[PDB]
């Protein structure tokens, strides 16, 4: 009837890719985060920001290429193309590291626009919105690492660059400087990721091994029409199996599939709380009862004090080349070496 | 070491001496458990989304499943039409058997491949090494992200077992 | 129209037998004519270091960062 | 009309000429440490 109704009926039309209202936020912003990454890893260097090479023009393969974080002198500037740093020039915008905030900002509005996509399709199909709530897990890892972690730090420079090996140094930068593995929020996150991979490997292998005979063929994939009301696997058998192997087992398909949602997602929320606590440098660095004892008793050694000496090697050896803006000129005689290494 | 801090003594010393992160079999199992926790929470949401009304709003959602029943407890056509619009139509498994097989394939193949990464790196066939790989025409070494990753490996290598070594190369 | 009925048709491969090589070679000429080094400011292998500047160039200012990169890219 | 397996054959070996070209330039040109 009205003008709003014609636009509402056009976006929600059955077509190849469902656009909806949320596609106006997703499809422009996701196309430019992805294309900003493919351009930045192919053409744009890191020679002026980090003093590296992170492009395909500079000989890096898929692994050692990245879209890199800007300089520490930029601080937390948004680095707009028209801004006071770039001033409209495209070429000087790329050399300062403007594509990285271009990827991260238009990417953050892609994950907004993709989670709104999951509320919109669920309302048209008419289902409960648990996909949009389980996808809030990965939103809490993008925001609290690519956004909330460099905000608490000195600049955008201490953020993960969007490249394969550039994530890998961020894994190593976070052990030596922060002792991230000791943090109980990672420990509750590893329990959800390795726990979530566990549940789909079991529920994959128990459904597929309690199937009913619905055909004479040896292939069991053929014997399932999608619109049938009979269940395709014996729940009573699978309960009787695991009650004797493992001792305790699900007797509820509604509780089972909810539990496959809770376990992976909670590991992304609990691990997201800790990385917000490392923006503020509130790290779980030391057990002081272990540290006061190892100072007074020069014979008491645990595995825990062995990890601190591994972190002095990370804090001293890479920090010269890690942070060229700070100009660490270490002598050879201050770098902690071991015996004969 | 059978412990918790002993595990991270194991992982870091294994990084300096073998470069596991650049090895493509740790790469094929990070994809196994990131993918595994994806398809876990992606399958577990689409079943819980499309549950059929069998309870009231006062009692629990889970009590609409009586144990050992023969009726199907969720509209599988509904969750197929949702994911058939969330990405596109042809990327959706209408077959629930082939769906519940792909949940068992992806992690297990990802951990078979990974556990044969530790095995092939037990015999000192390490991961990739792109240190000093990018040079200018003059021949000076241009750093990459692998050179920054190398300086993190050199810090752990010169500090692990700080008294056990006597000779310049950690052969063990 | 179904997708597999498109790519098996001849009229599809009539059009895209011209457009694909005319677009792949334009991606070749975008590099071999030295154009990509000037749009994105990526250093050529000749020009990581210069005769004067022998160190690693870094930006060291918030607001005159455009002017400082005008310095480090002339020589 | 073209048989579909001919299409996946020609495009499939075209990818191999693209991939093995990329593993070629890991040992030559830039990024080869020569």
């Amino acid at each position: 009837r009205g003008l709003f109704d014609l636009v509402d009926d056009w976006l929600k039309k059955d077509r190849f890719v469902f656009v909806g209202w949320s596609g106006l936020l997703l499809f422009p912003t996701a196309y430019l985060a992805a294309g900003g990454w493919m351009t930045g890893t192919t053409f744009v260097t890191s020679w002026y920001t980090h003093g590296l090479a992170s492009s395909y023009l500079e000989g890096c393969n898929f692994l050692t290429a990245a879209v890199s974080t800007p300089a520490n002198s930029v601080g937390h500037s948004l680095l707009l193309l028209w801004g006071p740093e770039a001033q409209g020039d495209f070429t000087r915008w790329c050399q300062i590291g403007g594509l990285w905030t271009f990827v991260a900002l238009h990417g953050a509005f892609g994950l907004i626009g993709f989670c709104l996509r999951q509320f919109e399709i669920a309302r048209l199909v008419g289902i409960r919105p648990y996909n949009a709530i389980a996808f809030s897990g990965p939103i809490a890892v993008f925001v609290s690492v690519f956004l909330l972690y460099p905000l608490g730090q000195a600049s955008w420079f201490f953020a993960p660059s969007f490249g394969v090996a550039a994530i890998f140094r961020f894994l190593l930068f976070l052990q030596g400087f922060h002792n991230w593995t000791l943090n109980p929020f990672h420990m509750m996150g590893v329990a959800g990721i390795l726990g979530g991979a566990l549940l789909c490997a079991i529920h994959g292998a128990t459904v597929e091994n309690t199937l009913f005979e619905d055909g004479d063929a040896a292939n069991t994939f053929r014997a399932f029409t999608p619109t049938q009301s009979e269940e395709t696997y014996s729940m009573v058998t699978a309960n009787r199996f695991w009650s004797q192997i493992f001792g305790v087992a699900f007797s509820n398909k509604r509780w089972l599939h909810f539990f496959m949602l809770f376990v992976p997602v909670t590991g992304l929320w609990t691990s997201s709380i800790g990385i917000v606590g490392l923006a503020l440098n509130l790290r779980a660095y030391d057990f002081v009862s272990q540290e006061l004892r190892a100072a007074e008793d020069p014979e008491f050694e645990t595995f825990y004090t062995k990890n601190h000496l591994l972190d002095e090697g990370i804090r001293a050896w890479m920090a010269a080349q890690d942070q060229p803006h700070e100009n660490f000129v270490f002598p050879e005689e201050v770098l902690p070496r071991g015996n004969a290494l | 070491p059978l412990g918790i801090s002993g595990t991270f003594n194991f992982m870091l010393v294994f990084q300096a001496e073998h470069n596991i992160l650049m090895h493509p079999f740790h790469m094929a199992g990070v994809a196994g458990v990131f993918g595994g926790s994806l398809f876990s929470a992606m399958h577990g949401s689409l079943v819980t989304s499309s549950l059929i009304r069998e309870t009231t709003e006062n009692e629990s959602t889970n009590y609409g499943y009586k144990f050992g029943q023969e009726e199907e407890t969720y509209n599988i056509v509904a969750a197929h039409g949702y994911f058939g619009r969330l990405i596109f139509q042809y990327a959706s498994f209408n077959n629930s058997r082939a769906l519940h097989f792909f949940l068992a394939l992806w992690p297990v193949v990802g951990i078979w491949i990974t556990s044969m990464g530790i095995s092939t790196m037990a015999f000192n066939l390490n991961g990739f090494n792109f240190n000093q790989s990018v040079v200018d025409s003059q021949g000076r070494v241009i750093n990459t992200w692998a050179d920054i990753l190398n300086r993190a490996n050199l810090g752990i290598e010169v500090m692990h077992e700080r008294n056990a070594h006597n000779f310049p190369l950690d052969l063990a | 129209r179904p997708f597999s009925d498109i790519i098996t048709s001849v009229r599809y491969w009539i059009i895209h037998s011209i457009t694909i090589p005319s677009l792949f070679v334009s991606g070749w000429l975008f590099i071999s004519t030295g154009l990509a080094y000037d749009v994105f400011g990526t250093p050529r292998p000749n020009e990581y270091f210069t005769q004067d500047r022998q160190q690693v160039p870094l930006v060291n200012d918030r607001f005159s960062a455009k002017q400082e990169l005008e310095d480090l890219t002339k020589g | 009309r073209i048989p579909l397996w001919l299409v996946g054959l020609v495009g499939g070996l075209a990818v191999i000429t693209m991939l093995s070209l990329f593993f070629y330039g890991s040992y030559s040109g830039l990024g080869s440490s020569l």
């Binding site: 077509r15 190849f16 890719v17 196309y31 294309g35 493919m38 192919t42 395909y56 023009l57 | 040079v135 200018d136 025409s137 | 694909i20 677009l23 792949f24 070679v25 334009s26 991606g27 070749w28 975008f30 590099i31 071999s32 990509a36 292998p45 | 693209m18 070209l21 990329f22 070629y24 330039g25 030559s28 040109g29 830039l30 080869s32 020569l34």
Partner: peptide
């Protein structure tokens, strides 16, 4: 029409692969 949907993703992809094959033959 869906010619704007695919070719926003495929016309760039062939253009960048025209550049990635050219970078294999560039040396110092």
């Amino acid at each position: 029409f869906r010619w704007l949907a695919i070719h926003g993703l495929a016309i760039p992809t062939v253009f960048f692969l025209g550049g990635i094959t050219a970078m294999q033959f560039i040396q110092r």
